[PDB]
Ligand binder design. Structure first.
Ligand SMILES: Nc1ncnc2c1ncn2[C@@H]1O[C@H](COP(=O)(O)OP(=O)(O)O)[C@@H](O)[C@H]1O
Ligand SMILES: [Mg+2]
Lengths: 160, 70, 50, 43, 48
């Protein structure tokens, strides 16, 4: 979505790459998130379908997991590396929901960027998510269900 | 789901709704207990927290500074 | 029977003609209009900028 | 008046102006990182 | 005198106070030694 690249500035001289500010950064960060979120969006659920990635030596890898498909996608952008390492943190800890946690984070950065354009501060936005998540975990405790009156290993079978 | 949350505590049928939802094979609303769709509670716990910290790390960024390699 | 060693396949469209299917192009077209929209976003109003 | 000291040098005040603008340029880069409403900077 | 141990993984809420010192290093476990032992006296071997 970003066009017309930022001009090289003579008043601010920093060694290396040029500095860029404003709303273009959060637009570029969300645009970098959609580059990886659209990849994993199709391979979600039973009806979801996956893709192939070649290793430039004839070999390839048909991958369903979010941690594996992002591990081979070496993201040069800094914001994408956070989600790449998150899936490597997700699959090692729990081993489930690797595709959903990236999809949840992508949708959050979408609407969070829309809220920043609506002129509320990110600190109030982060406080809104934390108080909401604290009530969400409290609601997850309410909707629990203890396994009872089940014949044999049926609860372990159907959950697998 | 809304019709279930709003409901009286004393309403069996409505409360049950709180329990079911989307089906991807047949394309209708059926019970998850009879269908067998189930997940652990630990899978959702600490998943939104990781997504929350993932959102916080990018959302708080204002400017981007890049140093070229030597 | 054949005229030569091999016979490379024909591309249907002309070489260099860009084409794409799916919902990605219409999102790119909408994002292209939003990119032009952002230039005229702060211009709207009496306190806007040239 | 005509007897005033011209001092022969305008290069020092010009170099000081170039340093102040260069110092204010980086000072204005981190102005929005102050207070509870500050923002992080990933380098 | 303050120590901060860096580690990947976990959540921000998992940070807690430890009354005693924590070792950043891990055990060898080549010959299959124990990993847990109660009422043990810790000796510092400064030789090879
Ligand atoms: N048979 C099924 N019926 C309904 N929903 C399902 C079924 N199988 C999987 N799902 C849903 O698909 C989502 C992702 O599942 P899966 O792809 O196995 O995990 P991951 O997101 O880690 O790849 C889950 O949140 C789950 O609710
Ligand atoms: Mg799964």
């Amino acid at each position: 979505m970003s066009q017309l690249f930022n001009n090289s500035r003579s008043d601010t001289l920093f060694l290396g790459g040029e500095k860029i500010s404003g709303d273009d950064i959060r637009n570029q960060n969300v645009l970098a998130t959609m580059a990886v979120a659209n990849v994993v969006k199709s391979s979600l659920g039973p009806v979801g379908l996956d893709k192939m990635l070649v290793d430039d030596i004839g070999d390839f890898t048909v991958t369903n997991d979010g941690a594996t498909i992002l591990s081979l996608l070496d993201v040069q952008h800094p914001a994408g590396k956070i989600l790449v390492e998150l899936a490597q943190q997700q699959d090692r800890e729990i081993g489930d929901g690797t595709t959903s946690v990236v999809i949840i984070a992508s949708e959050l950065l979408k609407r969070a960027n829309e809220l920043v354009k609506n002129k509320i501060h990110p600190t109030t936005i982060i406080t809104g998510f934390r108080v909401a998540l604290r009530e969400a975990i409290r609601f997850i405790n309410e909707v629990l269900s203890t396994s009872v009156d089940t014949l044999g290993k049926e609860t372990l079978i159907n959950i697998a | 789901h809304a019709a279930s949350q709003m409901a009286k505590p004393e309403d069996v049928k409505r409360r049950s709704y709180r329990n079911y939802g989307l089906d991807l094979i047949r394309g209708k609303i059926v019970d998850e207990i009879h269908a067998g769709v189930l997940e652990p509670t630990i899978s959702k716990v600490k998943s939104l927290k990781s997504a929350l910290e993932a959102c916080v790390a990018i959302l708080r960024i204002d400017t981007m500074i890049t140093v070229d390699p030597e | 029977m054949n005229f030569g060693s091999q016979t490379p396949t024909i591309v249907v469209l002309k070489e260099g003609t860009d084409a794409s299917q799916g919902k990605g192009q219409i999102i790119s077209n909408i994002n292209a209009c939003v990119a032009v929209q952002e230039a005229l976003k702060p211009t709207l109003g009496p306190l806007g900028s040239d | 008046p005509s007897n005033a000291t011209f001092k022969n040098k305008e290069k020092p005040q010009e170099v000081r102006k170039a340093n102040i603008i260069a110092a204010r340029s980086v000072a204005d880069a981190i102005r929005t990182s102050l207070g509870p409403k500050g923002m992080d900077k990933m380098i | 005198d303050i120590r901060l141990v860096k580690k990947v993984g976990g959540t921000i809420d998992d940070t807690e106070m430890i009354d005693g010192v924590v070792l950043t290093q891990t055990a060898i476990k080549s010959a299959g030694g124990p990993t847990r032992k109660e009422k043990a006296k810790i000796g510092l071997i400064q030789f090879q």
